[PDB]
Design a binder for this molecule. Structure first.
Ligand SMILES: CN1CC(=O)N2[C@H](c3ccc4c(c3)OCO4)c3[nH]c4ccccc4c3C[C@@H]2C1=O
Ligand SMILES: [Mg+2]
Ligand SMILES: [Zn+2]
Length: 326
């Protein structure tokens, strides 16, 4: 059996230190890592956030859950595959550690954020919410056209958490378990960019008006949503060669969707999904950075100055894309 060898290899491995694995670095790249090494990095994230000890996760179970999460990404989807989920979780770990966010959060919040980061795009089909709506997908019907994909990712997350041998939350008390699942749902839903756009104004205004207070539960929840977005988008902050390579993957995925829209919907794709108009990429990247990314990384730096490297990297990529666009 093939998946058994994977598990036995993972569970038998000594997990290298976070220092060795370079996972505290906001500039981290996964490109040179094997799948087994990404799994070992994930075990280290749970370990160094004190989650294994605290919640008494059995090693074999954590290993199985990680491998189940990885298997439930679609490997041939160009961008939304396990490496994107892994990178998102690594950004979350770096923000908590290097970015000094950890001590602002509870143990349950940290547990939920890590699980959510890893699970937030599970079973992604490589097409957008709008595409699912337009092709009358049953998922869109079930979820009333609202955060369609994200509902599905959450459903998948729960399925894996409940699967025999994978129950990494089986040790929590009833009140802790309830609380954790609620946070996970909110965290995964927050990764719908439409929800980020809807809610970010309140976050930015709280900050601007000197009203931001993490002791307020509603504001804590809002902050967690923003932090999820920040991690989900973090490829846009990476050193140029890394960001360029990842941007090519996203383009491949999006252009694939446009091809499907021409065939299935008989419509010209929007520029973002139109390979015929790939000349628009630089200008679209600048526009995305300016409209969606910069304000978020600026706000995050306001919350914790040690998150500044995300903003610095974002600004550097803006400059590089704009040099291409102009
Ligand atoms: C909805 N939406 C809008 C959008 O404009 N983008 C960007 C982008 C910009 C220009 C592009 C592009 C993606 O693909 C084709 O040309 C963009 N740039 C990245 C760099 C790295 C990783 C993901 C992205 C995305 C993802 C992101 C997105 O999800
Ligand atoms: Mg998503
Ligand atoms: Zn994502």
């Amino acid at each position: 059996e093939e998946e058994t060898r994977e598990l036995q290899s993972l569970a038998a491995a000594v997990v290298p230190s976070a220092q060795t694995l370079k996972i505290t670095d906001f500039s981290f790249s996964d490109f040179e890592l094997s799948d087994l090494e990404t799994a070992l990095c994930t075990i280290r994230m749970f370990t160094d956030l004190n989650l294994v000890q605290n919640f008494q996760m059995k090693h074999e179970v954590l290993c199985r859950w990680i491998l189940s999460v990885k298997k439930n990404y679609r490997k041939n989807v160009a961008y939304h595959n396990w490496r994107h989920a892994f990178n998102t979780a690594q950004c979350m770990f770096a923000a908590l550690k290097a970015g000094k966010i950890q001590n602002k959060l509870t143990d349950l919040e940290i547990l939920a954020l890590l699980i959510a980061a890893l699970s937030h795009d599970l079973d992604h089909p490589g097409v957008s919410n709008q595409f699912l709506i337009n092709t009358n997908s049953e998922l869109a019907l079930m979820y009333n056209d609202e955060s369609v994909l994200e509902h599905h990712h959450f459903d998948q997350c729960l399925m894996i958490l409940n699967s025999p041998g994978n129950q990494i939350l089986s040790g929590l008390s009833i009140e802790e378990y309830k609380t954790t699942l609620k946070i996970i749902k909110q965290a995964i839903l927050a990764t719908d960019l439409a929800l980020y756009i809807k809610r970010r104004g309140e976050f930015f205004e709280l900050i601007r008006k000197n009203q931001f207070n993490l002791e307020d539960p509603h504001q804590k929840e809002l902050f967690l949503a923003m932090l999820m977005t920040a991690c989900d988008l973090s490829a846009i902050t990476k050193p140029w060669p890394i960001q360029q390579r990842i941007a090519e993957l996203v383009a491949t995925e999006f252009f694939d969707q446009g091809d499907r829209e021409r065939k299935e919907l008989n419509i010209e794709p929007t520029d973002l999904m139109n390979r015929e108009k790939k000349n628009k990429i630089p200008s679209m990247q600048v526009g995305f950075i300016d409209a969606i990314c910069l304000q978020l990384y600026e706000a995050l730096t306001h919350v914790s100055e040690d998150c500044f490297p995300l903003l610095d990297g974002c600004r550097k990529n803006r400059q590089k894309w704009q040099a291409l666009a102009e």
